[model samples]
Structure formats: C-alpha cells, structure tokens
Target chain A: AHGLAWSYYIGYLRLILPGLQARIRMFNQLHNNMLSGAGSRRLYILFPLDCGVPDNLSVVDPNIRFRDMLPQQNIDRAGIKNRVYSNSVYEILENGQPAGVCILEYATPLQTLFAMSQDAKAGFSREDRLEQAKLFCRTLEEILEDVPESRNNCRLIVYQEPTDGNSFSLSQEVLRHIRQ
Target chain B: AHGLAWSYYIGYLRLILPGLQARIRMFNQLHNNMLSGAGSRRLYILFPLDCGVPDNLSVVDPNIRFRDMLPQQNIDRAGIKNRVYSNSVYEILENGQPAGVCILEYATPLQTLFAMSQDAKAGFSREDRLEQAKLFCRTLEEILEDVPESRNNCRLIVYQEPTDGNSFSLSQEVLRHIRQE
Candidate 1:
C-alpha cells in the first residue's frame, strides 16, 4: 500500500511539471520583452498570472500587455524634471483581457499617473473603461496613504493623449471624487 | 633564482603567522568578554590595535578595558526613552595604556556620550584625563557632522559619575568650544 501511494505521487508530479515549466518560461519571455523596450531606465513589471487560464495562454494576460509601447513615449513627452525614484506597471483586467494599463511613478515631490487603453481593439465599452479608470485611481490613493512623508508634499501629474483625452481625465475625476 | 625567492617568502610567512594568529585570538577574546557583559543588546566594539606593540601586549589596550562595567549601568539609570539605534565602544590611549573609554550611542533624536577613566589606578595624571576628554568630544563632533539628519534636532547627553564629575563635563566643554570656532 505504501509503494502504491509513492507511485501515485510520482505520477501526479510528472503530469504537472510540464505545465509549471511552460508558465515560468512564458513569464520570463514577457518580462524580457518589456525590459528591452524600457532601454536603460530602471522599471519593474508586475505581471500577475491567472491560474484559471491554460499554461500556454497564461503569458498572454492582455491587461499587462495593453500599452505595449505607450507609457515610455508618454513619459518622454511629459519632460518630467524631478528625479524618478521608482516606476511600476499595473494592469486592469476585464473578463480575462486588458481593459487598461497604469504606469505609476514616484519622482521626488511628484506622483505621476499615466494610463493607456485600446477600447476598440480590446472590445472594452465606455462603461468598462470608466470602471478601469476608477480602479487606477483607487490604486494610486492606496499607495499615497502608505508613505506619509510624501502624502502632503507630493503633487499629482495626470498624463493624457492629445487626440484622445476623455479616459485619462476620467481617472483624474475619479481621484478627485474619492478625495472629496 | 625564482625558486630561491619563493622559499624565502615561505620562510618569512612562517615567522609572522604565529604573531598574527595571537593578535586575532586576543581581539576575539576581548570582544567576546565585552559582548557577554553587554548581554543581549546589539553593541559593536571598535578596538583599534597598535601594530608597534608586541602581539601578546596588543590585546591589553587599556582604553577599551577601562570601563568594563560602567556604560550599561549609567544608560540604565538615565532611563533613555528614545530607541537606541546603535551603540559603539571607543578607547583613548595614553602612553600605551587606556586613559579613557568612550561609549557613543545614537538613540533617535539624542546622541548619548558616556566616558569613563581611571586616573590614579591607571597611572594617568589630571592632565592626561583632561586631554583624553578633549579627544572624546572631538570624536563625537566628527560623527555628528557626517549624519546631517541627526545634527540639527539631536540633543547630547553627557553621563558622569556623582563622585567624580569634572572629566565628563570637560568633554562637553570641548564640544562647545569647537562649535564657536
């Protein structure tokens, strides 16, 4: 009976090992692709995997991959003067697909918030984008509450696209609503 | 010629290795004794050795061994409310013997300075203790200047014995002198 239990455990491990290896490989590949696009700047990407999805498809978490090349471009245009202390990438997922991506940056006395969304391509309606904007605002407020040193002194800079500006403003509006 | 040079190097190493080992062993023993007395508190001992002294004698550096039991006693009495971030032990040597030992402590918004010396027993005169006090103050000021965060708000506490209080005050006097200049 003991030998039979040991063989069953071995068989279970053999079945799961390949799937685990595939997920890890996909996460590494995605991480590397993001870093290469970032160039010399120090940026940390947090791509949380969905265990519900198949192992091969786990790497294609659309929320993380939403703004493939926009955050870097938007930040460059902003011409921020303060020293960038740290940068993080966050995702807002809608039905297993990315609704929006938020780039949070701490630059000395400034808290810069930049968000990008491809509504038409991602099949996200206006209501979906609005909810995503609220999530982005909530995340920012939660972070600010932790670091008391920067809570009072730091000012917020909300980045928006020149041609399409409604969604980004919606994020700022949500933050203002919560503050009141 | 190359082979001959290698042998000479080996011979020199053999002669020096025993002395080196003795000094290291003495340092560790002294450090362990100080820590055991300190109990569980995180205290670091900086016992600078004199290369000029013989290996056996180097461990007996009087400055460090001067206040074997006084610092912890004084700190406990003072009832320091602030959290002690770090503690360090410094020794002041006079004529190859310890004239004084300084315990420097950083407790948040306070820099506590504690010094102890043996004049008559250690064969140190009044003049020797006075100079040692001055050195102690100078060391404290140098450390304060490096950490700008502590320089402005931090208050100094000078610990002294009730029976003999002049030397500890002398250290504070020297610190005041440097600030004016």
Candidate 2:
C-alpha cells in the first residue's frame, strides 16, 4: 500500500511539472515580446513612483490570472500606509478605445513594474504601440511637479529576459524618452 | 591718484579678509561642537526630504547672518517647483519653551542640511542637547508616511568638519539610531 501511495505521488508530480513549465514559458514569451523590436505586438512600461499615468487612461478590474500573479503583500502594505495610488490596473486606450490592459505596481518604494498585453482577437498595428508609448512619456513629464518623490533618486527598472534573439530597440527607446 | 586708489583697494582687502576668516571660523566651531563627544552643548539633525519635522516646532524669521549663509538658488528652485517644504527656519524647544534655532535646507534632492545653534545667553545643559536629538529622530519617524519622497532612496547627510579633536561620538550615535540599526 505504501509503495502504491508513493507511485501516486510521483504521478501527480509528473502532471504538475509540465503545467508549471508551460505557464512560465508563456509569461517569458510575453515579456520577451514586450522587450523585442518595434514590430512586436506587446509593450511594457517601467516607471518610478514619481511618475504620473495619463488622465485619458483609466483602470478597471484585472483578469483573475493577472490578479493572482501580483505581489499582493506589497500592495496591501501600500494600502495600509495610505499609498494606494502606487499600485493599479491600467486599461490601455487607443484613439479613445480600449486596446490593451496593463498591470502597474510598486514592487518597492523606488521601483514600479508595468506589464501590458493587447486584447485577444483585436488587431493592433505597430504604430498604435508607438503612439501609446509617446503619450505615456509626455503625460509622465507633465505631472512631475505633483509627484515629487522621484527627486529622491528613484529608478525605473527595465529587465529583459535572456532569450535566443538579442534585439532590445523598443526597451531602449522607451527609457530614452521617459527621462526627457 | 592711481597710487592712492591702489592703497584704498589694498586697505579694503585687508579689512574684508579678517572678517571673512572669522565668520568661517565661527561656523566651523559650531559644526565641530555638534559632532563632538557627549560633553558638547550643541546638537544638529540631518534628515532627508521624506522625514517630517515636529508640529511643536515652529518657523520664525532667521537672523541676517543665517539668511546670508543659505544656498538661496536651491531654495528658490524648490519654490518654483512647488517644494517649499524642503527648506525652513525652525525654532527648537525645550520643556515647552524656546531653546535654540535651526536652519534647514534641501541642498540637493537627496541631501538636506540642518545647522542648529542655541540662543545666546541661554543656559542649556549637555543633557538638553541629547534630548533634542532624540526628539528630532522620533518626530522624523512619526512623519515618514506623510513625506513619502524619502522612499525613493534618499539619504540623510551628516558632515563633520575636520578639527584638532578626533572624537565623532555624537554623529555616529545619531546615524545609528536614525536607521534603527
């Protein structure tokens, strides 16, 4: 009976491992696409706590899968400390229409993480992503006066997962204009 | 006439040099006393933009000399950017009464400079200065939530002017307690 129980445990492991690996792969693919070239469909924004999101953009409840992946502890701590503005679920809009969804969170006091993905079944052109990027940067600069915390030496962290292809033009472009 | 003008300029330089050197010496003396050992009757607090000053502490007009010594350009820029809270003239208290004056300024985004001196002719004990330091640290911690700017990796800079004495006990004590380390 003990041997049979051990075999059952081993069978469970075999089933779980593949699913975990597949989820990791999917997330990595999304991250890479965001950091890839201008032609890529996905894009991400990493801004410090001192940056302000655009007024035209609004937030709604995130998907259950995205909600589960957030650093919930940090978000709770910020809420307790009356800093709820640091974490958000932003709806990416194009030409006054919803095009994508973004999960923005303050992983730490000095760093904020933004991950974006387009709505499935909706076609978005490369120019759409570029325009979105430009609007984000412009809004951030306009609201610097209201967000004085960035002056305390905050950093916008950009992390590109290592992959087969080695092109990071979009990441470099966003970082350059965001500072200006 | 040229020779007389040259003599006048030389005389003016001679008069200005001594006064400038004396003022620098006085400032250095105050700085050294604050960083000196426990026996010192002087104390200073260095906190970042994120730290909050106590509500009991109030601002009053600073003396002319203190005003002249401040970095006016940085203060003006902060005002222009709507960050006036980064600079102030604070009146220190003891036993619910005025004791000393502190000049606080944000020299940079990361660094805030605080220089304090006791009221002339006021008889403040060594223990009084120590108590003031503790109060400043406590108030700073209490107000951290309101001033979230410090969370952006800001630093509280403590500078002790080089002097004949090698003791830096007070400076080390404040730095240790501020971090709760």
Candidate 3:
C-alpha cells in the first residue's frame, strides 16, 4: 500500500457523460430549482449517492473532486509512449515534468472485439483471427492515451499501428491484468 | 407519453470458466460465506444503502417506490421490438408488440436498391439523384413503421460500403430529421 499511492486518474470519465448529461438536463428544469428563482433551494437533490466500487467504476473518493473546466498547469519535462487499442484509445504523456507521465485509456470497450471477430474472413483461419484481433487491439492502443484532461498531466503520443504481425491484442492482452 | 412502456433487460447469466471442473469452484466463495457466518453480520449493515451511487453522480429517487421487475400486466401487447443493436443488426418493434425477429447483415443475402446503386455494374443505367432519393425515401417508409423506436430516436445506421463515393453520393442523400423536442 505504501508504494501504491492511491492517486486518482480520469480514465473512465466518458462512461458517466451519457448519464450525467441526462441528469444535468433534468435538474436544469425550472421545477428542479435551477430557474425556480429560489437561491437557497439546493438543486443537489439529483446528485449521486456515495458508495465505493473499483478504480475504473469508482468515482467516489472523499479526497477527490471534479472541475467544471480543467485548470491549467506548467510542465518542464517528460516522455510518453503511444499505442492503439481496439475499443479504447491510447495517449502517452510526454514533455511534462518532475519528469513522470500518466497513462490513460477507457475502462471498457465491451463490444468492439466481438464485432471484429464476427467480421472475420469466412475460412476462420488463425491468420485471419490474429489480423482481426490485432486491428481492434491496435485501434484501442492508439486512443489509449488520447486527449488528456490537461497538457500538464503528461506529454501525449498517439499509437495507431502495431510494430509487428505478432502484435498485442487488447482483449487478449488486458485479460491478465484484469484476472490478476 | 401514454403510449410508452419500456423494459430494461439483462440477459444470459452464466459462469466464465469452461468445462465441468470449473463449475465446482464457485462453491468455495458461497461455502466460505456460509461457514464464516458473514450473512448475520451483513444483515444489519444496510445492503440497500451499499448499492447506491456516489454524491457526484445522479442520486436514487427517494419518494417513489417502483417495481424491481415488470409484472404480467405490462407485457407488450402492441408489439415489442427488443434486441441489442449493432451495425446493420437492428430490432424491429412495432408499438408494444414483439417483432420476435432480429436482422443482422453486412453483405446481405439479398442486396438493396441503395447497395445496388453503389455498384453500378450490378444494374444502374443512369446516375439519377432524384430516383435514388426516391428509393431511399421508400425504404425508410417501409422500415420506419416496423421499427417504432427509430420514429424519433434512431441515432445512426450502417453504411453498406465505407466512403461517400459509390454509395448514394453526396448530391441528394444527406438530409436528417432533427425534430424539435
């Protein structure tokens, strides 16, 4: 626990956007108190209740909070690696300092792997399977470190293509991490 | 709003491990919980409260009590078109009735007027934008009623071939219906 500083990362923020946008629109209605002209009447009634889950699913940390717009910060040094993933994109934090980097990718891209598999060439050859798998894996890897919360977090790089035919597939690759 | 009824379905629960040997492994977790008397302690810990969301996200409604599951009275009588959508694989629900059929195709067994127009050698003598638009409009007319959700909520549809060239081209094929809410 000492080495593993439980610092937060804004990895899975995309998942909440759909549900958040819906709720925001709902609460902004006149009856919900936004335009009701009652300043003291708190519109916080529609906010989420606090319970804990995991890092990817977990947005509930007492010490952590989100901002309306990401604040700017200065960076003097850092380097980042770029890679593509099938469902999730990749971003490598480069050129930021005290000189360290942040790695960012979406938590789940559930259906993308299956879609590629279904579109496999009719023969079902191992070569074709690898090709399909590699395609999604590389795409996911490419956007894995995509569009950071701010430039100060890390120097960014976009990795879209795999270096070799025996490339890393996200579905096949990330399983070990999730399993452990 | 009176015409609307909806169901959220979570389907196909099963074990992840393959083969008979893996099935017995689940007993370890249940057997551990039972043997350790965790249930009694858990009973007082507010199970429902633990299931709630965090302060930053949308909160659960406190005033209204709703059913956890749909009752028999609420079954789709008009026609229910319920299937997870993907690409060309779409559901066709008419009113509250169940379409009972799902359509999934890429290079479909029988191609369509739009797809045929893309491949001119297949059978197109002329590149008439009006004729093509008429064909697309007719297809929309035929499918729109069957797929009730698409009447207003349809976000995206599949393209038989990528790129705008061979398809309907850009001339008369790019109009969308963003009806005022």
Candidate 4:
C-alpha cells in the first residue's frame, strides 16, 4: 500500500504490431494517454489462471489495485534491471489456495518472450523458454511484494501470445517456487 | 432508440489459439462467465480517438457505458448476412467534431482481412480488396437502421487488406466515398 489511491497500471497489450508504423502507432497511443493523464502505469497483470487443469487459458486482472502499480516514487527507485526487456509475476493466493498467476513480461523494447517465441526462426524454443522461467524467478526473488482477492472482486490481468509451444517449460527451480 | 440500452457485442479475438483444445478453452471462459453473470455478452470494442491523420488506425473506445448485457437485442433478427464472418465500423463524434472510429470485422471466424492478406497464397489480391469493400458497403446498406449512440454509433468505416500488388487499387465507387469532403 503505497498511500496512493489507485492502481495506475496500463493494460497488458498482446503486442502483435508487426511494422514500424504499427509500432509507432502503439507508442503514440501510449504517449498520448500519458499526456492526457489517463495512463499512468500498467493497469493489467496477465497470466495463466489454471495450470493444473491440463488446459491453457488466462483469467485477466482488469483491475489491478493501487497497492501495486510501482508508482513514480517507487519506480524511480525501483532499480529496474535492463538486461532483458521486462519481467514480473504475482501469485494469486485465494485463502492460501493458488487461484491464479499474474505476469508482466517484456523482452526486446516492445516484445515479450512469448512474442519472440512465436516469431523466432525456430519458434519459441527451449532457450527462450528457460530464459522466461529465469526471468520470472529473478523477478520473484528480486522484485516486489504480493496478495489475492475474491472471485471477481480483485482485478484482471491479461496475457496474450499466439503460441502454445509453452508447456512444462518452467525450470525445476521455477516450478519449486510456483509449486510451493 | 430501439428501446435498447447497449450493444452486447463480443470481443475481436486475434485467433491466436490454433488448436481445438484452445478453442474449447475459449468457449469455456465464455460459458463460465455466463454462468457467473459476467460475460453474458462481448467484451471489447476497439476504435480510434482522432481521424486527423490520413493514415489509418483505431483509437479504441475504452469507456462505452450501457446497462443490461444484450441491451434491447436483435443482432439476430437484425438479419445479418452470413456470406463472410464479421464487419462493422463506428465513428465517434465529440461536440460535433470527428473524434474517433470503431470497427468490427470478421473473416473465417478467427482472422481479419489483414491477417488473411498476410498469409494468402497470392497475398491479399485486388479480388480480396474489392470483395471486402463490397462487403463493407453491403453491410452498411443491408444491416442496421440508424446511428450516433442510438445504435452502434456513426463511426466512419475503415477496411484494409494487405496487398502483394495494387498499391492503391480502389474502385471508382470506393474512392468516391473516401474522397468525399
């Protein structure tokens, strides 16, 4: 709870823009929103909802609250690493039950590991997979704090990538944290 | 005002799911939401905020407020043509000034014309272009009764198909509407 009243997170975009103009357009929208005072931070935290169901799906957190957001004061001192584009995950603990997973991933300036995996020469390969798992672990070990809300009361985070090659791709260590 | 409060239109999915399991998963979400009284209707309506520039892009209308899930209803009795998958557009007017554009498009259920043009064997050919343009016109002519927030809003329609050729091959009629003051 950073004393801020709202979660300023912008939405988690699927980021499928392919051309330079498209990229510029994406940037322009974001920039314009910032100027207009509507978009201050990431609003959505996206990730898979039920990894145990033997299916692939996501429950989007459309309303990530203010306690998160990594607002200006914090972001300024967030000490964000720049080696990889971006990476984050939040655990959804429903009364101590693992209800869902929230993720913040960015890989190149405008792409995520999942995005890259889809277009990569060999597809989102093992290298890419491990790289992401590693990023998640790093974020958890070195990033911010956490919680869980009721069925529909908390927030929705949306994660989208056009590929499904990712499965059981997490490293054992990553699984340890997730599984634990 | 057709006694309706809002449009229950579904989202414009990017068709990333390539497998049956994935499709089922998507359906499950819809089904589950319906049971929970949330996703009884569609979720996203994307468009543009400004039409000042010549190049095309949607500004996206984020806050469309209407109560009741399906509102007054009749997209079914609206007697929509089924030759293709999806097509529609909405232009936003702010204080009588052009403020935005909203579009609804469908092709093969999971793909857009742009997406198709990207993968077509000959690419999005003129044939595809005219076909889509014709679809747009037909959609405007055949469907709906009116506009300006009363229905889906009077958004300027924009439709584009990626091309392997025909840099600017617009039919005379298509150009006429586009070039209109």
> B-chain TM-score, every candidate?
0.24, 0.27, 0.22, 0.26
DockQ of structure 2: 0.01
What is the Cα-based lDDT of residue A105 in candidate 1? 25
> What lDDT score is found at residue B82 in candidate 3?
18
Tens digit of per-residue lDDT, candidate 2, span B1-181: 1111122122122122223333434544755433122211121234322222222112212121122131112111100111111122333343445443333332111111111123233234434544443444444343333443322222234443234323543224333433342
Ranking by TM-score: 4, 2, 3, 1
Model 4 per-residue lDDT tens digits across residues B43-156: 222211111111111222222111111111111111111111122222334444543322222211112233334433425564563464445334432223332221322223
Q: What is the lDDT of residue B103 in candidate 3?
A: 16
DockQ of 4: 0.01
Every candidate's DockQ is 0.01, 0.01, 0.01, 0.01
Collision pairs in model 2: none
Task: Give the better candidate number (1 or 4) by lDDT.
Answer: 1
The worst-scoring run of ten residues by lDDT in candidate 3 chain A lies at A1-10
Model 4: CAPRI class? incorrect
TM-score of 1: 0.18
TM-score of each: 0.18, 0.20, 0.19, 0.25
- Give lDDT tens digits, candidate 4, residues A1-180: 000000011011112111223333344365442212212122223232221111111222222111111111111100111101122223334334443333322121112233334544526564555455444433322212232221211222222333455443322222233333
The residue-level lDDT of candidate 2 at A57 comes to 17
lDDT of 3 at A137: 40
Q: What is the TM-score of chain B in candidate 3?
A: 0.22
Best by TM-score: 4
Model 3: residues >4 Å from true position, as ranges?
A: A1-13, A16-112, A115-126, A150-180, B1-181
